[PDB]
Amino acid sequence: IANQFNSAIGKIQDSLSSTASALGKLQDVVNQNAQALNTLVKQLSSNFGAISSVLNDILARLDKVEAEVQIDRLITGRLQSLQTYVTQQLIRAAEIRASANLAATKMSECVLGQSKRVDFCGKGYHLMSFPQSAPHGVVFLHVTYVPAQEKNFTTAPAICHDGKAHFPREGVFVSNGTHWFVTQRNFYEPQIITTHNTFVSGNCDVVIGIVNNTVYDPLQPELDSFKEELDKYFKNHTSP
Amino acid sequence: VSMTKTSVDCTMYICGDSTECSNLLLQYGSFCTQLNRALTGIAVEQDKNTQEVFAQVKQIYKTPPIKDFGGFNFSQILPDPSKPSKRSFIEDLLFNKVTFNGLTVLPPLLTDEMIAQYTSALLAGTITSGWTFGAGAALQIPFAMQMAYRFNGIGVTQNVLYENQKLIANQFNSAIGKIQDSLSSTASALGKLQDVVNQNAQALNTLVKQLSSNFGAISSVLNDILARLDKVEAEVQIDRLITGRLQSLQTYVTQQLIRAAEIRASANLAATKMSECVLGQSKRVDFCGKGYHLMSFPQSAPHGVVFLHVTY
Amino acid sequence: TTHNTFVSGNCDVVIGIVNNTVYDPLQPELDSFKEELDKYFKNHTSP
Amino acid sequence: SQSIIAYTMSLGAENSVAYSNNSIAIPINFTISVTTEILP
Ligand SMILES: *[C@@H]1O[C@H](CO)[C@@H](O[C@@H]2O[C@H](CO)[C@@H](O[C@H]3O[C@H](CO)[C@@H](O)[C@H](O)[C@@H]3O)[C@H](O)[C@H]2NC(C)=O)[C@H](O)[C@H]1NC(C)=O
Ligand SMILES: *[C@@H]1O[C@H](CO)[C@@H](O[C@@H]2O[C@H](CO)[C@@H](O[C@H]3O[C@H](CO)[C@@H](O)[C@H](O)[C@@H]3O)[C@H](O)[C@H]2NC(C)=O)[C@H](O)[C@H]1NC(C)=O
Ligand SMILES: *[C@@H]1O[C@H](CO)[C@@H](O[C@@H]2O[C@H](CO)[C@@H](O[C@H]3O[C@H](CO)[C@@H](O)[C@H](O)[C@@H]3O)[C@H](O)[C@H]2NC(C)=O)[C@H](O)[C@H]1NC(C)=O
Ligand SMILES: *[C@@H]1O[C@H](CO[C@@H]2O[C@@H](C)[C@@H](O)[C@@H](O)[C@@H]2O)[C@@H](O[C@@H]2O[C@H](CO)[C@@H](O)[C@H](O)[C@H]2NC(C)=O)[C@H](O)[C@H]1NC(C)=O
Ligand SMILES: *[C@@H]1O[C@H](CO)[C@@H](O[C@@H]2O[C@H](CO)[C@@H](O)[C@H](O)[C@H]2NC(C)=O)[C@H](O)[C@H]1NC(C)=O
Ligand SMILES: *[C@@H]1O[C@H](CO)[C@@H](O[C@@H]2O[C@H](CO)[C@@H](O)[C@H](O)[C@H]2NC(C)=O)[C@H](O)[C@H]1NC(C)=O
Ligand SMILES: *[C@@H]1O[C@H](CO)[C@@H](O)[C@H](O)[C@H]1NC(C)=O
Ligand SMILES: *[C@@H]1O[C@H](CO)[C@@H](O)[C@H](O)[C@H]1NC(C)=O
Ligand SMILES: *[C@@H]1O[C@H](CO)[C@@H](O)[C@H](O)[C@H]1NC(C)=O
Ligand SMILES: *[C@@H]1O[C@H](CO)[C@@H](O)[C@H](O)[C@H]1NC(C)=O
């Protein structure tokens, strides 16, 4: 588990250092803000249907009663250009807020805790996550348990023993093809079907797909060994 | 999940087929690049919204030919093989239930056959392999043992399923019977999707009515002003129409950017419900339907997703 | 039963506790051992 | 020989699941994995 984790951290380190595009969601936010600021400054070169885009060159050519009408055009067009920028900034800022509230929720639920929510802390089952800072952003390194190489098995919903039906306390009944076992669902670790691994409920006629197999009792030998010794003691006590 | 991609060519809208109006419009600068860019940003994020909701699996799982799901009759929600589009009988019902000037509609990247196919992959994975196909490789399980793990998941011991399996399957079969009847019966059932089609249609209809406005020029028709007047008398008249039509696009693009942020928020909720209700089982009270969550099935709709949440 | 329950503390602490028996399933199992052990003593008197 | 091709996109690998009324698959092993996620 350590050697897998220490390798997976090494693949993150290499990947970020190797490819261009991995920072895309942050570089995009830098590029949109640069593009919008650049666009806002370029609008100052625009005439807006006035005689010129240079405010001092209007004033240096026309007299005041009509130089005002040209300046009013530039005021209208530049005020419209700020309003376009601020509307773009507000709509973007609402997006970044949504992404910051998601990031805060990921910090709270994947870093300060372990999440049972599927996909919310990466693919697999969430073990833990580690935060890393980035320019204007957060990176989460989500660590997950992923089921690897699998094997198919025969299975049953219940086991029948003394005409009573038996069900797993945790996990699932599986056969290797000849013998029956009980195992935890998320990792193959077979165990003998005991009275301590299972609970009884009702009789074998009600359950579709129930199978016959023995259920082991762990206490039965701890009284039968004690019984065979007790009988040997009675045998010895015939001798005096 | 989405809304119709629209591109409005601001030059062709403001200054339709006119060189003189185009040469005036250049004097307003980069606004037309901002209008075209913003609507391209929206048009691209609609494929993204659709992709985050439906493409949550990179492997197209398919139903077995045998249908021995322990008595649970999924035939209403699996694909029908016979139709030219491979959709479910409830998806076909949902598709019936929703009804010159630089305007263009752009088609979604994922056609409705491909949204039905991603929905089929998610649903065939969900029936045959539990939540496991969300964690990694799909691991099969018998459907009654999947429902047993579910019952343990809501804190009801799994013998309650196996003792009652005929009833639990008849109740699931009956509840899908009510979904079928409900969607056949009432007009308003898909209102949340139809409301999005209606707002886009209303906002574009409003944007078109603004081409018939005068804004204090002699005519609402750009060709009349260029036909009736010489070049210098025309500048003043066209420039009114430029100002008012430009402001009509600045309005419409702002209304669409706000509305796209709302459809985005709905798509991210739908992606969260796809992950947490279809690819899993949720402890979140009320998140995956009313009751205690057992499992959910996705179904496509025009520009949307329908979840059939199954609850104890 | 002792398999359905867990033990802590005593009857004086828990507000609203009630008296009932708890069935220990080892006890009647080893009672099936008790009368068999007892009969084997009775028989073993005879030689 | 390189040229632009145009094609209907496939949605992924097709994979018929080995479902049966009495078969389960269980992992004999696991991979720990680290995925980066990046948020503005
Ligand atoms: C299904 O799982 C079973 C448990 O692992 C397995 O049975 C076990 O098989 C081993 C040999 O592979 C036996 O080993 C013993 O066999 C005799 C016992 O007298 C000795 O000569 C050997 O030295 C060794 O002690 C186990 O006894 C046996 N266990 C049981 C409960 O039968 C099956 O082989 C597996 N089936 C398949 C199809 O793989
Ligand atoms: C699971 O194990 C059970 C115990 O070994 C076994 O039960 C036995 O089933 C047979 C066949 O049904 C019964 O045979 C009797 O059936 C009627 C009388 O009821 C007569 O027509 C027959 O001639 C014969 O007497 C056994 O009585 C019955 N035994 C018990 C103790 O219940 C199950 O059949 C096994 N099931 C599987 C799937 O392996
Ligand atoms: C729950 O079960 C308890 C155990 O049987 C029971 O406690 C017993 O209550 C009686 C009556 O109060 C006591 O009787 C004795 O009380 C004093 C000595 O403490 C004497 O003066 C009396 O003459 C009499 O001998 C028992 O001593 C007491 N048992 C113990 C072990 O303390 C509770 O009363 C029961 N409560 C309910 C609500 O059912
Ligand atoms: C687990 O089993 C499935 C299919 O079921 C088995 O089919 C036989 C091969 C035999 O083992 C039966 O007793 C089982 O019922 C396997 O799926 C097959 O995979 C191979 C490639 O490995 C492919 O050529 C076959 O067409 C598949 N058959 C079917 C019916 O899907 C699966 O690979 C097995 N998994 C493991 C890890 O053993
Ligand atoms: C699953 O449920 C469907 C819908 O009730 C069943 O389909 C109907 O079956 C009857 C009898 O064969 C036909 O007359 C109807 O025309 C069918 N209706 C439709 C819409 O196809 C189906 O038979 C059930 N399948 C199982 C295995 O129970
Ligand atoms: C579980 O998977 C790991 C690999 O992730 C297996 O470890 C490898 O085992 C082989 C020999 O079987 C060695 O050559 C490799 O060098 C091992 N790799 C590592 C990272 O240790 C492990 O053996 C598998 N175990 C089972 C029971 O399947
Ligand atoms: C599984 O299906 C077969 C038919 O292919 C049937 O004989 C068998 O009894 C079924 N078992 C269960 C548990 O449904
Ligand atoms: C048999 O019983 C006698 C006492 O009666 C004792 O000394 C002896 O050790 C016993 N042996 C065994 C094998 O129990
Ligand atoms: C519950 O409340 C009633 C009064 O309404 C009281 O008589 C009773 O003793 C209370 N039960 C307990 C266990 O204290
Ligand atoms: C008494 O013990 C003998 C063995 O020593 C046994 O055969 C017999 O059945 C027993 N009788 C009774 C009444 O237990």
Tab-separated table of C-alpha atoms in Angstrom, chain A residues 25 35 39 43 46-49 73 77 80-81 84 87-88 91 95 117-120 123-125 146-147 150 152 155-157 167-168 171-172 185 199 201 206-208, chain B residues 27-31 34 37-38 48 56 131-132 134-140 142 145 149 157-159 162-163 165-166 239 250 254 257-258 264 272 275-276 279-280 284:
chain	number	residue	atom	x	y	z
A	25	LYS	CA	-8.644	25.351	-15.409
A	35	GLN	CA	-8.055	39.120	-22.462
A	39	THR	CA	-10.049	44.367	-24.610
A	43	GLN	CA	-11.671	50.170	-26.703
A	46	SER	CA	-12.124	53.338	-30.923
A	47	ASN	CA	-13.739	56.464	-32.440
A	48	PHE	CA	-17.380	55.550	-31.481
A	49	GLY	CA	-18.385	57.557	-34.603
A	73	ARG	CA	-19.772	60.329	-27.920
A	77	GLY	CA	-18.814	54.661	-25.891
A	80	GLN	CA	-20.541	51.420	-22.459
A	81	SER	CA	-17.082	49.730	-22.629
A	84	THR	CA	-19.410	45.575	-20.677
A	87	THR	CA	-20.810	42.848	-16.416
A	88	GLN	CA	-18.298	40.264	-17.745
A	91	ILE	CA	-20.714	36.992	-14.336
A	95	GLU	CA	-18.501	31.313	-11.724
A	117	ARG	CA	-20.028	10.229	-1.845
A	118	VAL	CA	-19.142	8.561	-5.175
A	119	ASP	CA	-16.880	10.589	-7.565
A	120	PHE	CA	-16.808	13.628	-5.179
A	123	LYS	CA	-12.751	7.744	-8.949
A	124	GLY	CA	-12.448	4.713	-6.628
A	125	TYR	CA	-13.413	4.681	-2.941
A	146	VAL	CA	-9.527	0.985	-6.612
A	147	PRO	CA	-10.501	-2.721	-6.958
A	150	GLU	CA	-10.859	-9.711	-10.132
A	152	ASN	CA	-15.575	-14.671	-10.860
A	155	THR	CA	-22.702	-17.073	-4.987
A	156	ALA	CA	-25.971	-17.542	-3.078
A	157	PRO	CA	-28.320	-15.201	-1.140
A	167	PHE	CA	-27.327	-14.865	5.982
A	168	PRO	CA	-23.898	-13.057	6.257
A	171	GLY	CA	-20.020	-9.637	3.277
A	172	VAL	CA	-21.221	-12.296	0.827
A	185	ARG	CA	-17.364	-7.543	-0.481
A	199	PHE	CA	-27.207	-14.822	11.508
A	201	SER	CA	-33.766	-15.852	10.010
A	206	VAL	CA	-39.147	-18.818	1.623
A	207	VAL	CA	-35.857	-17.688	-0.051
A	208	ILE	CA	-35.401	-17.944	-3.847
B	27	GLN	CA	-15.923	52.465	-35.476
B	28	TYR	CA	-17.555	50.970	-32.314
B	29	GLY	CA	-14.527	48.636	-31.989
B	30	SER	CA	-14.265	45.190	-30.410
B	31	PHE	CA	-17.890	44.801	-29.084
B	34	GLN	CA	-17.078	40.213	-27.443
B	37	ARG	CA	-16.996	35.212	-28.211
B	38	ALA	CA	-19.497	35.185	-25.336
B	48	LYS	CA	-19.500	20.364	-21.564
B	56	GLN	CA	-19.529	9.503	-16.363
B	131	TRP	CA	-22.172	0.800	-7.748
B	132	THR	CA	-18.862	-0.998	-8.561
B	134	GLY	CA	-18.220	3.834	-10.652
B	135	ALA	CA	-15.290	2.789	-8.414
B	136	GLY	CA	-13.366	0.928	-11.180
B	137	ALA	CA	-13.917	-2.118	-13.411
B	138	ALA	CA	-17.568	-3.306	-13.461
B	139	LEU	CA	-17.934	-6.336	-11.130
B	140	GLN	CA	-21.112	-8.384	-11.739
B	142	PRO	CA	-26.999	-11.012	-9.039
B	145	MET	CA	-27.921	-9.566	-3.964
B	149	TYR	CA	-26.591	-4.774	-0.178
B	157	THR	CA	-31.157	-6.293	7.326
B	158	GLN	CA	-30.927	-8.141	3.976
B	159	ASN	CA	-33.221	-11.061	4.971
B	162	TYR	CA	-35.168	-12.215	0.346
B	163	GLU	CA	-38.271	-13.026	2.441
B	165	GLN	CA	-38.643	-10.485	-2.906
B	166	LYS	CA	-41.883	-11.202	-4.860
B	239	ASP	CA	-25.919	55.235	-36.463
B	250	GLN	CA	-25.585	43.480	-25.367
B	254	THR	CA	-26.128	39.288	-20.925
B	257	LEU	CA	-24.806	34.516	-19.946
B	258	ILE	CA	-26.900	34.712	-16.745
B	264	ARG	CA	-24.646	25.174	-15.716
B	272	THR	CA	-23.739	15.155	-8.871
B	275	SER	CA	-22.509	10.202	-9.567
B	276	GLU	CA	-24.226	9.934	-6.150
B	279	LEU	CA	-23.232	5.282	-9.692
B	280	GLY	CA	-23.880	4.748	-5.925
B	284	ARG	CA	-27.970	12.214	1.844
